[PDB]
Amino acid sequence: TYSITLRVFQRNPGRGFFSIVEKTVFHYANGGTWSEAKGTHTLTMGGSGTSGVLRFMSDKGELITVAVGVHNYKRWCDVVTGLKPEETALVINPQYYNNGPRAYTREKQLAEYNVTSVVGTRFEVKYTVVEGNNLEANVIFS
Amino acid sequence: TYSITLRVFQRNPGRGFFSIVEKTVFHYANGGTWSEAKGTHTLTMGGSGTSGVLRFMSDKGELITVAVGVHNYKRWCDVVTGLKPEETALVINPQYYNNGPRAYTREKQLAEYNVTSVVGTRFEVKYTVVEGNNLEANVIFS
Amino acid sequence: TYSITLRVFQRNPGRGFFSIVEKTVFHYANGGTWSEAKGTHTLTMGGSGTSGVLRFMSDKGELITVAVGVHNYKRWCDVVTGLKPEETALVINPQYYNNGPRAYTREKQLAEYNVTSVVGTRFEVKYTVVEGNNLEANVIFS
Amino acid sequence: TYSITLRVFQRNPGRGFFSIVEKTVFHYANGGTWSEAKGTHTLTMGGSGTSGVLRFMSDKGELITVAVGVHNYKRWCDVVTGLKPEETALVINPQYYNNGPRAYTREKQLAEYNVTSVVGTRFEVKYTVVEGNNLEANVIFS
Numbered sequence A, B, C, D: 001t002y003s004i005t006l007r008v009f010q011r012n013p014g015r016g017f018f019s020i021v022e023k024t025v026f027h028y029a030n031g032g033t034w035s036e037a038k039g040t041h042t043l044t045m046g047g048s049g050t051s052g053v054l055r056f057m058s059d060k061g062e063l064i065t066v067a068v069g070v071h072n073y074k075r076w077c078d079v080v081t082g083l084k085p086e087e088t089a090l091v092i093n094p095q096y097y098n099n100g101p102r103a104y105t106r107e108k109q110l111a112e113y114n115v116t117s118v119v120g121t122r123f124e125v126k127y128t129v130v131e132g133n134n135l136e137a138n139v140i141f142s
Helices: A089-096 A103-107 B089-096 B103-107 C089-096 C103-107 D089-096 D103-107
Strands: A002-010 A018-025 A032-037 A040-045 A051-058 A063-071 A074-080 A112-116 A122-129 A134-141 B002-010 B018-025 B032-037 B040-045 B051-058 B063-071 B074-080 B112-116 B122-129 B134-141 C002-010 C018-025 C032-037 C040-045 C051-058 C063-071 C074-080 C112-116 C122-129 C134-141 D002-010 D018-025 D032-037 D040-045 D051-058 D063-071 D074-080 D112-116 D122-129 D134-141
Touching: A002 A063, A018 A032, A018 A040, A018 A089, A018 B032, A018 B089, A032 A051, A032 B018, A040 A051, A040 A063, A051 A089, A063 A089, A063 A103, A063 A122, A063 A134, A074 A103, A074 A112, A074 A122, A074 A134, A089 A103, A089 B018, A089 B089, B002 B063, B018 B032, B018 B040, B018 B089, B032 B051, B040 B051, B040 B063, B051 B089, B063 B089, B063 B103, B063 B122, B063 B134, B074 B103, B074 B112, B074 B122, B074 B134, B089 B103, C002 C063, C018 C032, C018 C040, C018 C089, C018 D032, C018 D089, C032 C051, C032 D018, C040 C051, C040 C063, C051 C089, C063 C089, C063 C103, C063 C122, C063 C134, C074 C103, C074 C112, C074 C122, C074 C134, C089 C103, C089 D018, C089 D089, D002 D063, D018 D032, D018 D040, D018 D089, D032 D051, D040 D051, D040 D063, D051 D089, D063 D089, D063 D103, D063 D122, D063 D134, D074 D103, D074 D112, D074 D122, D074 D134, D089 D103
Parallel strands: A002 A134, B002 B134, C002 C134, D002 D134
Antiparallel strands: A002 A040, A002 D002, A018 A051, A018 B018, A032 A040, A032 C032, A051 A063, A063 A074, A112 A122, A122 A134, B002 B040, B002 C002, B018 B051, B032 B040, B032 D032, B051 B063, B063 B074, B112 B122, B122 B134, C002 C040, C018 C051, C018 D018, C032 C040, C051 C063, C063 C074, C112 C122, C122 C134, D002 D040, D018 D051, D032 D040, D051 D063, D063 D074, D112 D122, D122 D134
């Protein structure tokens, strides 16, 4: 199995406050499950080659997704911003697979990624444990 | 908009204790979002014609999904049991649409449904507010 | 250290639906802390001789407390029903100590307790692991 | 009645990551209750003259309390850092009343408070809605 444990940091009240509105798990590698403990989120997966997505909404209405997973035994991540309401995590997660438009990002196997949304919100994913089967990352808003 | 608020009742410790492991929202009707308040779960949707799925796992390893949504202005529900680990909610939610194998169940527009899993766990969805745009249901395990 | 992990089973929608409104830890035995994981609640304590209280409120307005702890190396529990709004868990938890009016209930070292409230709600605490330092109980509202 | 809604912003992973370990409500003003919705926390109280406390623990072991309440119709707040394990919120909340050692801090009726702990963690409580019965504050760990 692989697990990825996320801690969510929110830095700047002027950007609003984000909460989870959806959580998906892709079906490869025997799937996987999200769980919560002590204010953290863990994605547990059946092997290498799958992922999951958290979609967040701020109290100012902004919608963004965070994807994390393992590709060929190495962690990967992505963040998509500026989402329309119909672009649910259920739409986004499969776009990393089957030659979809985000597959290239998975294939980069990034240990960190940074993006600012068009409305001005910074998002970062930073793995703090970057090797092995029990991975850890901080997700930082603002 | 439509909302569906769920309260989860668990009746029988011998069946184990279930917790959420995934939550999806289908992309029709401008999508929608899950939220939590006072121990309840609300699916808020952009209009009639979409749905969302909660997948649960028990501490005995059982995997089941609960689907709720609105079809032609009337509520619907379904429960799928006996799931394999790769049959994530991301797999299940779309099966209600595009002539998929569960579409017939959505089309029934049920206000209640009951199923027992092969391993012997009873599940019921029962709408308590069955008309209008702010719907309410109890989800009962065991 | 001692821990007590609780699983809350709400059986009967006719009683309404309860959620936590307060969680206290008494200061003996070097204190302790509440945590949440996978829908369960764990009280971790620094030794034998202390306790904590969860207060619950139903969506019908009912207020009740559940107390769990370890006294002379044996688990104990209590449920207090029919509470007024001013009788917060902060009021109730100390009543088990310093010769307070609930000390005798702690002293019973009960592994199970059953009580039905003035509005008809049945409550049960039943330890499923009843010895050792890693205690487990089901809390059932019926 | 009065309510205080809190949004918790954790800014700085170097301080570790905090989660709630206790939540108390003082018994004046007909008590009150904590609730959670969309990742936020609301203390609802029966009138002016009471308060509640959230105790937090970091994954590095740090223990701190945040107190919020209403005194003579004006909001107040406090943050206590450097706590020992035996100094539970159940110990701290009463210290604001009955001529206890923290009463003067309640009496200040602060709309903002800033303190840095012995291990270097910066804490701020800043009310964003500072008047009326529906109060709002940001709690920032930095």
